[PDB]
Structure 1
Amino acid sequence: AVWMVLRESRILSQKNENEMFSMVFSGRYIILLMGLFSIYTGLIYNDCFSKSLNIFGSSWSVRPMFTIGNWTEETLLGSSVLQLNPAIPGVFGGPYPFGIDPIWNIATNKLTFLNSFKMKMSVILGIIHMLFGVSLSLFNHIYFKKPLNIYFGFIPEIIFMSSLFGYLVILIFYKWTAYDAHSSRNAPSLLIHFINMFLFSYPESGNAMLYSGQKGIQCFLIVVAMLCVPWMLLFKPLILRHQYLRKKFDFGDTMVHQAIHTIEYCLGCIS
């Protein structure tokens, strides 16, 4: 991108019959940012051609203390094994200042540590952007003075999305700070609670709960989300019909338009 910008005056003042170069040139300022942010995220991902960047701040574990923790001459058996570094041994811990600790770039199980992050992060970021996109609709509905689009639309729509999907995001952060390796066995499963949430499935045992009273919260949120649907589903066409008879309006077609909006909105939120 820097090249294209530095040659911007020379590229403009010539013929460019190659449409492939023209396209990327036209987006050259878009690409510039693409690179700059890719650098930022790559540094946190700590991957430069599959190489991490060790700043001598990697204190994830203290191998000398690994041997102290009842590992005497393990490198003899090690000749045929790996051996996973234990959590909460009393001698390991502490976050990496910026990005993922370089140690994981040389692990055989990065394929669970790092993949877990990216999955959960993707959900968090996606939902937030979705909520932002909905928030913007409020300014537009106000600008055009459509009270109905906020009293029967925005409000139940944002509650619908928040109550189901924002709740999930909170729980993801909650577990990270709520549970340590001390409870890694039978540790709560975020996906299972999320699915059981929607289904009102509350087994007596088999899954640990994230917090006391969660069952009441799970039921409440789903009921509200469902109660949000009538608002967006039927209140606008119904009130418009009333306004017709009071003031004196294709009621049937209006119901179709609103129903399609509701159906696509709710199903699309999930997808």
Structure 2
Amino acid sequence: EMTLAQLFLQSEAAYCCVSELGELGKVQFRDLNPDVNVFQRKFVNEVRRCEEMDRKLRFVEKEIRKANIPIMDTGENPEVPFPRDMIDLEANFEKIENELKEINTNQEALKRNFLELTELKFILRKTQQFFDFVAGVINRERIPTFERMLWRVCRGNVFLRQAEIENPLEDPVTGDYVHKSVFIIFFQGDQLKNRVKKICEGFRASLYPCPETPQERKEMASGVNTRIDDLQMVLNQTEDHRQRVLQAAAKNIRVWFIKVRKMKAIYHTLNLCNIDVTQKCLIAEVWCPVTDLDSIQFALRRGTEHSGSTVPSILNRMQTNQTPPTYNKTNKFTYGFQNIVDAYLTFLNSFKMKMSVILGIIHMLFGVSLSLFNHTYFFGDTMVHQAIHTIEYCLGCISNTASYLRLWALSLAHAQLSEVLWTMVIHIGLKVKSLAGGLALFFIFAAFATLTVAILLIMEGLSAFLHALRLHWVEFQNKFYSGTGFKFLPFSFE
């Protein structure tokens, strides 16, 4: 019982009315300008601004989990932010966006700076110990095959120094947490420098310039000492600057979702306005219940006050020839049971067959009588149509009433296997002479506990439940229900 009754807007009340109208959830905004593309719907530039904040929110919800920060919820339907507050949000949203995008690129360059200088620092101690040209670093696992190749292709020789570094360091992707070793490539020749650099890249060694003169090694060792600890200082100082704004974001992102997601939803309905015609006032052609005409109108009177507009909006009524979408009670323990139908030995044999056949005739009687009350509620092609209407009811009810005979025969299937199941429970387990009461009854009663429910209640139960849907759909909904249907779909919250 819906009406396409018109509703007018004034574009100073186009947000605050619709938002409180979208804070109720009884409205079915219908697009009546279909002759237009997906762009130029009056607000395409601003719905991308909500989408840009949506892209920033889907990005910031990912990085808030990689640092593993607990998320505040405080679950409540909030106030929808005004377009006055919208420009103030992109100052705040992009501040968190640009700072966190910069830091993850800056900390990775700082971490790459930290590991390289510590790798250079550990070779300064071990070589100045050995002293009292190429210097470089290689892992311990590749050092015996390196000097075997270094003796091979250089083949004069280079006097190699072998000295293993202490507790494992890590270059970021290669290698992850390995203890390496230093080496010394003097050779004095300056021709074999080309013949060793290919080997240093082939074994993936990391080489650094050493000053090579005495007391400048300790001079640069004092230099990289002060450089590393300052680099160690700013690395954690970026990290405590990081976590202090992650938890500042952790108090934000949950409510900041439903700020813009409610804004993006109502602006999509602002795209769904009438035809964008000729003045600074709007119309809305919505579907609405007659039982809720008053409550949405007082809500419309509430919406024009929240913007502070002096002029209330109106509601015209009319009549047309279109779909009257359905609406009902929609109760909680009535929600799931409604959604299923919205998707669309010798003596017992003689007695239970005919009484079930009359029961199917009684179910068809109540169904066909509902067609007369539905018809009362509102030549050549009429002959061939009503012939298909009548004789498909004639031979059709026979196949319906034949499928009512199964629900006794499925109970005969229910009775026979339950005795066999029962027989095992009463006979193979309990009729053992010596070792019955312990291990023998325990595995059989477990079969009486677990194996009967999968066979009699799971598969036999679902099949008769699927049969009962077939008794409802093709055998009961074929008598009165036209089966066309059209849902209401109110403008929801989440």
Question: Structure 1-normalised TM-score?
Answer: 0.31
Greater helix share, structure number:
1
Rg comparison, structure with higher value = 2
Query: Which one has a larger percent strand, Structure 1 or Structure 2?
Result: 2
Q: Which has the higher contact order (CA 8 A, sep 6+)?
A: 2
TM-score normalised according to structure 2 size: 0.19
